[PDB]
Amino acid sequence: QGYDVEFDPPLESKYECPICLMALREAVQTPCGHRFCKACIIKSIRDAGHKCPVDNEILLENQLFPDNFAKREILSLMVKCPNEGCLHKMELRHLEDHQAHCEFALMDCPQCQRPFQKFHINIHILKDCPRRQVSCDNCAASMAFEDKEIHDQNCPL
Amino acid sequence: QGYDVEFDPPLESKYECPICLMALREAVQTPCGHRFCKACIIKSIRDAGHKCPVDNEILLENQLFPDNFAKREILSLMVKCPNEGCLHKMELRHLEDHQAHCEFALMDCPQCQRPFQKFHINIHILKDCPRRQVSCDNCAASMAFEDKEIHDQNCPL
Ligand SMILES: [Zn+2]
Ligand SMILES: [Zn+2]
Ligand SMILES: [Zn+2]
Ligand SMILES: [Zn+2]
Ligand SMILES: [Zn+2]
Ligand SMILES: [Zn+2]
Ligand SMILES: [Zn+2]
Ligand SMILES: [Zn+2]
Ligand SMILES: [Zn+2]
Ligand SMILES: [Zn+2]
């Protein structure tokens, strides 16, 4: 459940969760000195027993402490945007905001629900989409572009 | 009051105590995500107020948590022995035991109290020390080597 992104430079093992094997998300530390994503360790306790997965030391959920030092470090690590075509690199803490604006993120056309990269979305929606809505010059009827021919050949004019 | 030893490779800032500026000794972490030697932060609280010295966030001694993850990391860091002439490098956790056996550690002669490196101790004690005890061939009197000449001319023979 940890951060599944591409770190660059590569993520150091000290920041990896022993359970999910990815960058610690909401890092917490045990009394026996082991770091885990809050979600992974909790699930391990409420499932594999009240012990640390790495050394079987007895562990209680109320003994965990938030490792904010680790969290701050991880969130400052340089990551690459996953979107195809994008070459932006940024600190992890800024990746979420970025993805909401990245022009390379896939998006579904509101008319034909097919997926397209954001930078192409306006061209698709207004020039290529077979389901884009257009109006008849004669009766002002609105239809899907792909249905225009059959409408025009039999329009009440 | 942190570990004052030469790390090699050099100690990373992340393991340095903001207060004493040395490797964290008995590392503890605050709610606001900052690490400190347990002794330094407690002294800071019981002296500069109930707050983290780095950001002034309110801090209570009972809010600190032992950062055993950091402790383990720091104790596994390679360090150089401080004794002159020694070239041994080892993990910090082994330095203490090493110093108790290092041949380059200074030591006081039990007879003249002067300091000497351990590898030279035996030679000093038995062959050079002016205060080494020696017996008279005539009366069996024990005296400091430096006082032997005088003693010949002052028997009881
Ligand atoms: Zn995890
Ligand atoms: Zn453990
Ligand atoms: Zn991007
Ligand atoms: Zn479409
Ligand atoms: Zn029409
Ligand atoms: Zn300190
Ligand atoms: Zn702080
Ligand atoms: Zn040594
Ligand atoms: Zn001596
Ligand atoms: Zn004598």
Contacts (Cβ under 8 Å, ≥6 apart) of A85: A104, A117
Tokens of B84: 């002159």
Report yes or no: B36 and B27 within 8 Å, Cβ to Cβ: yes
Query: What's the resolution in A?
Result: 2.2
- Domains of chain B, CATH where assigned: 1-105 (3.30.40.10), 106-157 (3.30.40.10)
Q: How far is B108 from chain A (nearest CA, A)?
A: 41
Give the Å distance between the CA of B5 and the centre of ligand 6.
13
| Distance between CA atoms of residues A19 and A36, nearest Å | 7
Q: Are residues A67 and B72, on separate chains, in Cβ contact within 8 Å?
A: no
* Chain centroid, CA B84 distance in Å: 13
Phi/psi at A65 (nearest 5 deg)? -130, 145
- Among B16, B26, B29, B52, the strongest candidate for a mutation testing the A interface, having the largest count of A CBs within 10 A, is B29
Provide the 3-class DSSP secondary structure of residue B30. Answer: coil
Report yes or no: A57 and A30 within 8 Å, Cβ to Cβ: yes
* Chain centroid, CA A128 distance in Å: 28
